[PDB]
Design a binder for this molecule. Structure first.
Ligand code: 865
Ligand SMILES: OC[C@H]1O[C@H](O[C@H]2[C@H](O)[C@@H](O)[C@@H](O)O[C@@H]2CO)[C@H](O)[C@@H](O)[C@@H]1O
Length: 513
């Protein structure tokens, strides 16, 4: 599928892709290999679907948070730089691109949101979020506004949400512990909704609108990353970059991202990509080429970062980064981001209340792990005859009651559909972990076809248990957990919006009560 003898690269439209293409030209001048740089819309969504079919770019650029999902899906090639190259980058940047013990990408730069303010409108930036309403009122009398930033991406709103105690996954990570719906998160989002209620912000303000307003000098402040600095320079706005405002006396905690370059598992040009990334991009001159297009932030390369660190704007970036947290790269990050995105937009527009919106975001973020906990335990206890003695953990009553519901209803299905299941089992012929990996396509084909209800979900899991008993019987018990993860993946991927609308596994319990 992917063409040999050339390099195709994907990077976001807000990054210095003209600078990157110029690095690609130097690579072409040396090697005779053409390098095509593209910046397609929603590439972070497009990549996992096209790469799965063996297609897509040789190299994909994104923040490290999305890269665990890719690797888990077998979409990323394991990268193996020698010691000499590894020592040229900061170790913690390597940490951000490590997944299950393996390095799955090259770290490029460290990104953190900062407060960007117009020094001509606002000689001193506000230290607190609380004082911004009164500041806006003051600025409105001059035909200006205080603050405008992207409200369509939760990335920009998260620092405020996390300030008073809101969090994604509790940190060792406890993935079952999601704090998107606690008091702190409610406090942060409410303050944002109130800003909109009191005409201090507009719910439909996106990236382009916020950037245009600041760079034209219509609003005193914005919230953005280093990549935005270029266009602000062009606009000749007397701007400064500083620490984010505190909320309730506590610092804003932005999720910190490490711009990373991954190599497609289906790429026939893995050696070319490695050569490009190591010996052309991750150099003083290579990063400078991109940085001069759009600023990268604090780059992973020590030799170049030592120079950039002298920039007050970089100092402000790293200060904000220190008060924030490095994003997790667990596969669930995509689901978390989608849930929180919807929650922020819905609360901002009044479609839901803060309590309602964050409630759904909680259910959406927990959905995979909670589903896995239930499906894994059912499959394993059915196969072995004995239950799991371990505590259910967070949201334990839900998991426990769902499992008990599943036991009652699942056993009925397996009983009544026994002959049908045995016929299906024989046709699939499942005898090792290799065969279990093949099931994903067949499973998705049958399940996603037709209507949606709890009954089909029970059938899905019950046949999974039926297969699990077969796997155990033929001494393939090690294949049960991969099967459980596979089924769980299919379920939450295909019925994500439906499950959330049913209030998750609580809905399942109530439905069969
Ligand atoms: C129970 C039944 C009766 C008649 N035809 C059937 N069957 C259908 C296709 N293959 C077998 C089935 C049937 C057999 C096995 C599973 C299902 C499912 C769940 C969706 C896919 O489940 C899996 C497929 C392949 C491997 C799997 C490994 C582990 C766990 C699940 C696996 C359904 C369903 O989605 O409702 N059905 C019923 C079904 O799809 N029908 C087709 C339309 N008319 C009613 C029956 C399962
Ligand atoms: O808004 C959710 C989004 O946040 C992050 O995306 C950032 C990205 O890290 C930055 O480099 C820049 O492009 O802004 C983006 C926000 O629009 C996460 O990396 C991403 O996974 C997540 O969906």
């Amino acid at each position: 599928k992917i063409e040999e003898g050339k390099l195709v690269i994907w990077i976001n439209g807000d990054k210095g892709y003209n600078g990157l293409a110029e690095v690609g030209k130097k690579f072409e001048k040396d090697t005779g290999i053409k390098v095509t740089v593209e910046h397609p819309d929603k590439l972070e969504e497009k990549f996992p679907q096209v790469a799965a079919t063996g297609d897509g770019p040789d190299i994909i650029f994104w923040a490290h948070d999305r890269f665990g999902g890719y690797a888990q899906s077998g979409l990323l090639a394991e990268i193996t730089p020698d010691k000499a190259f590894q020592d040229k980058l900061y170790p913690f940047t390597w940490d951000a691109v490590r997944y299950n013990g393996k390095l799955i990408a090259y770290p490029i730069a460290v990104e953190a949101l900062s407060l960007i303010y117009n020094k001509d409108l606002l000689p001193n930036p506000p230290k607190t979020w609380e004082e911004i309403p009164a500041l806006d009122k003051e600025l409105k009398a001059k035909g200006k506004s205080a603050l405008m930033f992207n409200l369509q991406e939760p990335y920009f709103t998260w620092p405020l949400i996390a300030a008073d105690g809101g969090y994604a996954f509790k940190y060792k990570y406890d993935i079952k512990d999601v704090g998107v719906d606690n008091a702190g998160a409610k406090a942060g989002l409410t303050f944002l909704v109130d800003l909109i209620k009191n005409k201090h912000m507009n719910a439909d303000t996106d990236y382009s609108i916020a950037e245009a307003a600041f760079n034209k000098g219509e609003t005193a402040m914005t919230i953005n990353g280093p990549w935005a600095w270029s266009n602000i320079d062009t606009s000749k706005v007397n701007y400064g970059v500083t620490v984010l405002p505190t909320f309730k006396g506590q610092p804003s905690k932005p999720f910190v991202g490490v711009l990373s370059a991954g190599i497609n598992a289906a790429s026939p040009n893995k050696e070319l990509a490695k050569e490009f990334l190591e010996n052309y991009l991750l150099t003083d001159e290579g990063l400078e080429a991109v940085n001069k297009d759009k600023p990268l932030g604090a780059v992973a390369l020590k030799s170049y970062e030592e120079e950039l660190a002298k920039d007050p704007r970089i100092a402000a970036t790293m200060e904000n980064a220190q008060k924030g947290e490095i994003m997790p790269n667990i596969p669930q990050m995509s689901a978390f981001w989608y849930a929180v995105r919807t929650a922020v937009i819905n609360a901002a527009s009044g479609r839901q209340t803060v309590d309602e919106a964050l409630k759904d975001a909680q259910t959406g973020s927990e959905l995979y792990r909670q589903s896995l906990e239930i499906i894994s335990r059912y499959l394993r206890e059915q196969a072995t005859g004995a239950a799991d003695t371990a505590p259910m953990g967070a949201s334990g009553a839900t998991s426990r009651k769902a499992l008990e519901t599943l036991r009652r209803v699942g056993d009925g299905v397996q009983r009544n559909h026994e002959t049908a299941f045995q016929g299906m089992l024989r046709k699939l012929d499942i005898k090792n972990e290799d065969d279990v990996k093949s099931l994903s396509r067949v499973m998705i084909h049958v399940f996603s076809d037709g209507v949606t209800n709890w009954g089909r979900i029970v059938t899905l899991i019950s046949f999974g248990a039926f297969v699990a008993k077969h796997l155990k019987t033929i001494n393939q018990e090690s294949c049960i957990e991969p099967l459980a993860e596979s089924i769980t993946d299919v379920l939450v991927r295909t019925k994500r919006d439906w499950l959330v609308k049913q209030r998750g596994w609580d809905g399942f319990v109530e439905f069969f009560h």
